[PDB]
Amino acid sequence: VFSLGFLIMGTICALMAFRKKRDYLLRPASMFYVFAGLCLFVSLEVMRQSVKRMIEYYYSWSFACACAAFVLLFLGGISLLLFSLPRMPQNPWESCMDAE
Amino acid sequence: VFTFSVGQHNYDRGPIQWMACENKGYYYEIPSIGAIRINTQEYLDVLG
Amino acid sequence: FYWLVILIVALNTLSIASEHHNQPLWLTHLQDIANRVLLSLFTIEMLLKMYGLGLRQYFMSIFNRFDCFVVCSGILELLLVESGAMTPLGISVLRCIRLLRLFKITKYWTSLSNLVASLLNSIRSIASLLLLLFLFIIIFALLGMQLFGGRYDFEDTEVRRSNFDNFPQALISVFQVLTGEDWNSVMYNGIMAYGGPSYPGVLVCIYFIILFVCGNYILLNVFLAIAVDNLAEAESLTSAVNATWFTNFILLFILLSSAALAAEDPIRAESVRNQILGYFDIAFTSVFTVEIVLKMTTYGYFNILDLLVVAVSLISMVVKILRVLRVLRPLRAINRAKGLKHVVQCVFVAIRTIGNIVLVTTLLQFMFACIGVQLFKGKFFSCNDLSKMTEEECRGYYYVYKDGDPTQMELRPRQWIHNDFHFDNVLSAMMSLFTVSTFEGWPQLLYRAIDSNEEDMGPVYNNRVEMAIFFIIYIILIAFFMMNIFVGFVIVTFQEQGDKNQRQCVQYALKARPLRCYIPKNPYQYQVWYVVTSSYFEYLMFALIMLNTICLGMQHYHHISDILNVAFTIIFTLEMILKLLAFKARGYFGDPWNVFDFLIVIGSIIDVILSEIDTFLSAFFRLFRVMRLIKLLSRAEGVRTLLWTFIKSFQALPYVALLIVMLFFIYAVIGMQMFGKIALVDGTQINRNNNFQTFPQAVLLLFRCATGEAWQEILLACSYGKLCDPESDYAPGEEYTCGTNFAYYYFISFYMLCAFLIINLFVAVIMDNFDYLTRDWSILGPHHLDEFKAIWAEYDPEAKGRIKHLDVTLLRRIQPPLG
Amino acid sequence: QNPLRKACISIVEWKPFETIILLTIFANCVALAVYLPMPEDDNNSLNLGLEKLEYFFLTVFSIEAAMKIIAYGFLFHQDAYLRSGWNVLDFIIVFLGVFTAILEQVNVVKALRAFRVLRPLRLVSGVPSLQVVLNSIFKAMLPLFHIALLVLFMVIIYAIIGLELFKGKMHKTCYYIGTDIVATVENEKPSPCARTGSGRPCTINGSECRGGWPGPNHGITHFDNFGFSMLTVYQCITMEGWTDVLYWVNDAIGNEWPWIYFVTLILLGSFFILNLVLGVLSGEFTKEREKAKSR
Amino acid sequence: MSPTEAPKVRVTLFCILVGIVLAMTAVVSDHWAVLSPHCEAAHFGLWRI
């Protein structure tokens, strides 16, 4: 539930970042996705250990769905944050948070 | 006099063998547990 | 004669390097019916060209100055073996002097005698810095003789050879802790000699912590200095289809072809997964067998490699060695990747630079191996129980006592064992000295060469404690000196192809830009903005951060450790929202440090609510409160500047780290193939934690060997004697056939390669930074030009280009070096 | 300062004093070397005659300290003797010497006995070439300050991470059933064990996995509190037995996650850090060679 | 428009949406765990098994 709430709150900033030249807004949005992803993973944890406290066990269809959604959200939020953060200066004059 | 030098050490053993060779006795060395049985029953050779 | 005199020295070297243990008798015959004749043939060369150079010119050149020493020693030694000079140690310490004649091929090379013209002066000038190292070692040995002298008297039967019982042993212990090898076990003996893991005892760790760090440092410094100065001397004295579609699509398909080699199962022959990759192999092969004609139907050295790769992927669609020849699949990516070939060739042009220092080192290695064969040949045998000193006595059974308890014994058959790294020939001696030069297992070879008794007899505890010298000179020459002048070679060579300060500043004062500050209007919200950037407020923030850090250290093993967690979470989430309100969510998200702060606050909130949900009814979400003291790097500008300076040049050169990852990939695949069926038995070095079964395990094993762990024991855990894994396939009775003696070619190469490339990556990243490292921090530099940027963006909240004239009064606010 | 009423010793102060006090301190070093440390209050003959020799070595240095202290001020008078750089060290040496020597004959322990190994430092005072060599290392370790403030903080961060993740996990092991003997194999060292987890279950037949085990290296290597966690982190950072800590954590909690903690600490802590100091010091060497090439 | 209408941010915001939908279905599709004591095969999920 918390993961899906984070996805909800992240899509908002992802969309409102397209208008009024609110590009900065893509920095928080990404992060929310990350946590969503992270949340999904710990969700996994719980179910996983429950499976080993109840005989045979086997993940068939939706475990791939979750193990894909988590990694995609996590890596995509991380890379979105890397792309929104401008650049490692690479020069004695350049700087992070520089004027355009 | 039977003298026994026990353990693996760096100390001088000459005086101990001298005490052994002078007073009609004998000198034995016990470096480990495996030597104890055979070195502690051998003085009966000298006594005989 | 210029070549006939090297023919005789080569014939003499090939004869002194053929003496092994238990050599045939005709070999012993040859080795001296080819020594007296060759000594007399060295005598004719000190007569006829002696007489050629008149009378007094055979003492003007240090070249032929010690050649008379060779003849004197030779004949004097001939007539001392026909005497009572027995005690084979004594007879052999002159056959080591016989080795002193190999310097005649070094006599003849220009650059091999030009380098020592200052390399020898290196020590002579630094003899007062090497002496400070000797004094450091002596003081720490005299301190160890006081702290742990006669205190390792543990009642158990386990032998602790590295103690501090006398002065030579204390010297050996301090030197071994200096080289870094097994210093933790010395520390553990020092801790157990005192109380134990308690308040009195553990403080003895400080000794070792001071002996390593401040001991490594000094040493390092010295050597480095030497290297650089001696190299300067050798560098200054001598000075005075064809679209992006096709390529970017094939390049992203060689990576798949390669990663299909990673995911595999060496144990299961055709595993349930293995034929899936067998089917994918045909796909990855037939997408490549088409684009070999789209490249050479337009046309008729680098693509013949690719054609051979696809040809061997086709013939496979003993011969099982060919499956090792399919590991150059990622070696074809040096075709399309243009930045890759540039470093692949800059490495092959950097190998030509270091070819001068490799031969002298290899020669020193060979001569030390010859001295080792003269000293410890035949002397590395032993019995299971150390009371039987001969192969004939070491027969039958004996008892071993568990935990040294005389009432708990077991039977063990005793066997005459040979050491795994010995000195019987020059090949085995060279392998042993190779393991010694990487610092791994060298105390076990030391304390075994010290106990060396006779030619075919077992060890005698502390027989020859002077043998340590052999192991302490070699370590100082090879592992401390030649290795350091090798690194000095590569660093000083990179130095060149890498005025200047004026150039840097005139480039700075052109392309630099202004800075935004987000100074807002509306005094009602400017109020909280004013108290946001007060030094007092951020200092309270820093103090709160260190308070949270000190509260994080208070936890121990066997609840005020969570209420304070929530109290700090609250402090930080209110600081965040106050900063947001003072910045309107537009200046806040402009600073990357504020992005990190927001990350930490969201993570902390999630952690606290997860913990109290769990108590209302994730081990890594608790790491977000630890990440807090990383934002303590927004105040230390020197540390932040150093970190950015090195991260920049680490990001600038990814194609040199791609070489290392390719080396790891290739060697891990080859090792999964070669030794991947060995069993997993505890007590050995191929076990549950360190094996070759899967690609992650093999990569982690290779990373362990890169770090220089007991890699020479993994090298012996794979050598044609190893039980096969039960899941594998093998004829019955044919079990101990896993592992191959190819390991010696696998590991010895890898280490060397892994020590080259790594060194490479260490020099590039350094020379790319030689601007910031060799900078006078006072005369001039970009720190003043950032001072200017800061004080300029002060007057200019928003960039908007440049600013008003008066606020000309700023020039009164600059440092005189710039203002 | 005061008139030449006390300087009855400044006449032979300029004699070749170095070629005698150097041999005296060298003989003192040799008598320090051939000393044999014996366990539990034992001694031999040569160890008794080397304590009567520490009265000939403590009486020469002390009268020379007097000869040099009264020849320059009462103690300092212009910061002359005491504040002379390499004359305060010798004062502390011969001032601890007599102190502990008379203390040893007042209770008629060995803590101040270990300050006896500083006397070998006097040789540096003896030759000024060593004196200028030794002052260059303290001159080149100031650029290594922002690197030490980074290594300290990285060690403190990884210590706290390991304290959060591994505190109290390596305390079970498999003993023999009904015994207090750890059950291992020929060359295996006692490693942790797991019951009801992804850790390792141990295989020896008559063995059971229970707690109450002080820890892997006799109770020294573990993340049980901040001190021991700092100690094991620092040990791993030197790349000495870090694979042992990694393997023990693998046996305690599981195989798949813990490597992330140790491969990151070995890359950042060891390789990145040593690369920083190999650059900062070589740069200092290069700049101190370049400033002298213009001379 | 540098980080907001570039292709390299739009490909990533594409890759995000797949995770979005697969996650909003993963919460609701109980097809990731089976148990068989041993014919009573189970299917676990998040809300109802």
Ligand SMILES: CCCCCCCCCCCCCCCCCC(=O)OC[C@H](COP(=O)([O-])OCC[N+](C)(C)C)OC(=O)CCCCCCCCCCCCCCCCC
């Ligand atoms: C000073 C300047 C910078 C210095 C430091 C810079 C980075 C700081 C150090 C990075 C932290 C290292 C990673 C955490 C170690 C994880 C070990 C572990 O998970 O095992 C224990 C635990 C095992 O505990 P457990 O839960 O199995 O134990 C109990 C068992 N149960 C709960 C089931 C009953 O693993 C986890 O809790 C899950 C961790 C998985 C996810 C964590 C991995 C990602 C962490 C951040 C990634 C960043 C990589 C490094 C950053 C780059 C820095 C160079």
Ligand SMILES: CCCCCCCCCCCCCCCCCC(=O)OC[C@H](COP(=O)(O)OCCN)OC(=O)CCCCCCCCCCCCCCCCC
């Ligand atoms: C120039 C660079 C190098 C300079 C040299 C500096 C050397 C310093 C490195 C040595 C530090 C190691 C300290 C070891 C002792 C740690 C505390 C300890 O030993 O025990 C842990 C203690 C609780 O343990 P326990 O005994 O179980 O308590 C109850 C028992 N029934 O729990 C505790 O009370 C310990 C809590 C401490 C937590 C501190 C964590 C970080 C605090 C420091 C951050 C500030 C950085 C410094 C700022 C300087 C800036 C320039």
Ligand SMILES: CCCCCCCCCCCCCCCCCC(=O)OC[C@H](COP(=O)(O)OCCN)OC(=O)CCCCCCCCCCCCCCCCC
């Ligand atoms: C002046 C003379 C001119 C000659 C110049 C020639 C230069 C060659 C330099 C190569 C380096 C050699 C140094 C290695 C030490 C020798 C190792 C050795 O000889 O091993 C012996 C081993 C058998 O030894 P044993 O224990 O008896 O076991 C036998 C059972 N099969 O038998 C073996 O199977 C060992 C196989 C050896 C494999 C060597 C692989 C080396 C590849 C490294 C290339 C990368 C190096 C470039 C980077 C350098 C930067 C540091």
Ligand SMILES: CCCCCCCCCCCCCCCCCC(=O)OC[C@H](COP(=O)(O)OCCN)OC(=O)CCCCCCCCCCCCCCCCC
């Ligand atoms: C020119 C270079 C100079 C060289 C620098 C030398 C470094 C000096 C080392 C300083 C060590 C400080 C130790 C002081 C700790 C105080 C003692 C204490 O009270 O703590 C005990 C500690 C935990 O408590 P304990 O007793 O074990 O718990 C039992 C139940 N109560 O039990 C312990 O285990 C305490 C042991 C802590 C040791 C931590 C070691 C890590 C520090 C090393 C990192 C520094 C890296 C330097 C890099 C600089 C590069 C040039």
Ligand SMILES: CCCCCCCCCCCCCCCCCC(=O)OC[C@H](COP(=O)(O)OCCN)OC(=O)CCCCCCCCCCCCCCCCC
């Ligand atoms: C800064 C200076 C130096 C920088 C130069 C750059 C060179 C870096 C080289 C360092 C490489 C270190 C690689 C360490 C990763 C090893 C992973 C590992 O050990 O995990 C073990 C674990 C065991 O699981 P398994 O084998 O399946 O069996 C248990 C199943 N119940 O396995 C698992 O459970 C999870 C397995 C997935 C882990 C994959 C992540 C890494 C795997 C390989 C990464 C590299 C790939 C190619 C090699 C390049 C490395 C250089």
Ligand SMILES: COC(=O)C1=C(C)NC(C)=C([N+](=O)[O-])[C@H]1c1ccccc1C(F)(F)F
């Ligand atoms: C081949 O020389 C060697 O025998 C080497 C020995 C014996 N030891 C090790 C560790 C080497 N290595 O490759 O790292 C080389 C060595 C060593 C010191 C300087 C230079 C090299 C050089 F060989 F790499 F040049």
Ligand SMILES: [Ca+2]
């Ligand atoms: Ca090691």
